[PDB]
């Protein structure tokens, strides 16, 4: 945990404050789309659709996915410890139900894929898009590692 | 089967000069990326136990260099061959007894250390964005194929 906290903290610190601000801006403005786009693409997969069947979970997961994206992409130094606890909780939920790891990680790949066009279509410069995308990818990756290994 | 189409589509939808620059970045810095991969990875105790002796080090570094170049210089015809590689690597990791969460940790390190190399290149910011995008997606799809194999 100590090593994970330091790395995630370092990721936020080494990320330029205007870049983290723009990443947070991208998150808040498009988290709703990213969540609903995530859900349908995932459910296309037969192995994944069996877990995303009912309407109640849909409304719950979309809201939770939206909150998750906002928390991770708008992460500050103070939020690092809390974010780690969140990934543990999510890991418990996925384990409680019995959702395979390779299916969840496929979702992370889906999430990272649909995030890029949103950043690419943003009003920012090419250099800023690169740094926002870099911070976003590393943040999602470290979050995935914490969730998986928990 | 779907993995082939997605990896093929990834190469097709990627601009040829971008993939060329990504391939050039690979060839020029794969040697550094491999050694940088080793140092960061061995920090983790669970991973270090597999990377103890010097002989294993040299092979993984050599294999990492070839892997990075092959994946980033991927053409459409190479896609099927690349998938076969991931199966072979997965068998090796299984033969040794390397945990899945440990291998994926290596992928994160690889994607992490790749960014400064692309960032410090002589290309434009726009080209760097697309090269980095193609590189990340290529490594991600390769990881999923390797993991499920
Ligand atoms: C194929 C991939 C995935 C599937 C099928 C899946 C499925 C589920 C299901 C069925 C639940 C239970 C929700 C409920 O009972 O109301 C859940 C919870 C949750 N998942 Fe996933 N999940 C996937 C990947 C992900 C990813 C990639 C993330 C974040 C990046 C994520 C974040 C969450 C969160 C935040 C919750 C709710 C946590 C809470 O309520 O405390 N999931 N997931
Ligand atoms: C912590 C992460 C990892 C560890 C500790 C690890 C360890 C190893 C070891 C000990 C070998 C065999 C070396 C030998 O027999 O001399 C090996 C094989 C190999 N690994 Fe990994 N590995 C990791 C992750 C990865 C990743 C992320 C990649 C690629 C992105 C990769 C690609 C390969 C390749 C291409 C080979 C050799 C394939 C062949 O001989 O045909 N490994 N790994």
UniProtKB/Swiss-Prot annotation, chain B:
Keywords: GTP-binding, Heme, Iron, Magnesium, Metal-binding, Nucleotide-binding, Transcription, Transcription regulation, Transferase. GO terms for biological process: cell adhesion involved in single-species biofilm formation; negative regulation of bacterial-type flagellum-dependent cell motility; response to oxygen levels; response to stress. The record marks 38 as: Involved in oxygen binding and important for the stability of the Fe(II)-O(2) complex. Disruption phenotype: Disruption results in a 2.5-fold reduction in surface adhesion, a 3.5-fold reduction in biofilm formation, a large reduction in curli production, a drastic decrease in csgB expression (400-fold reduction in aerobic growth) and in an approximately 3.5-fold reduction in pgaA transcript levels in comparison with wild-type. One of its GO terms (molecular function) is metal ion binding. Changing residue 93 to A: Same biofilm formation activity as wild-type. Loss of heme-binding ability. Globin-coupled heme-based oxygen sensor protein displaying diguanylate cyclase (DGC) activity in response to oxygen availability. Thus, catalyzes the synthesis of cyclic diguanylate (c-di-GMP) via the condensation of 2 GTP molecules. Is involved in the modulation of intracellular c-di-GMP levels, in association with DosP which catalyzes the degradation of c-di-GMP (PDE activity). Cyclic-di-GMP is a second messenger which controls cell surface-associated traits in bacteria. Overexpression leads to an increased level of c-di-GMP, which leads to changes in the cell surface, to abnormal cell division, increased biofilm formation and decreased swimming (the latter 2 in strain W3110). In a strain able to produce cellulose (strain TOB1, a fecal isolate) overexpression leads to an increase in cellulose production. This is Diguanylate cyclase DosC. The gene is dosC. The chain holds residues 6 to 154 of 460 of the full protein.
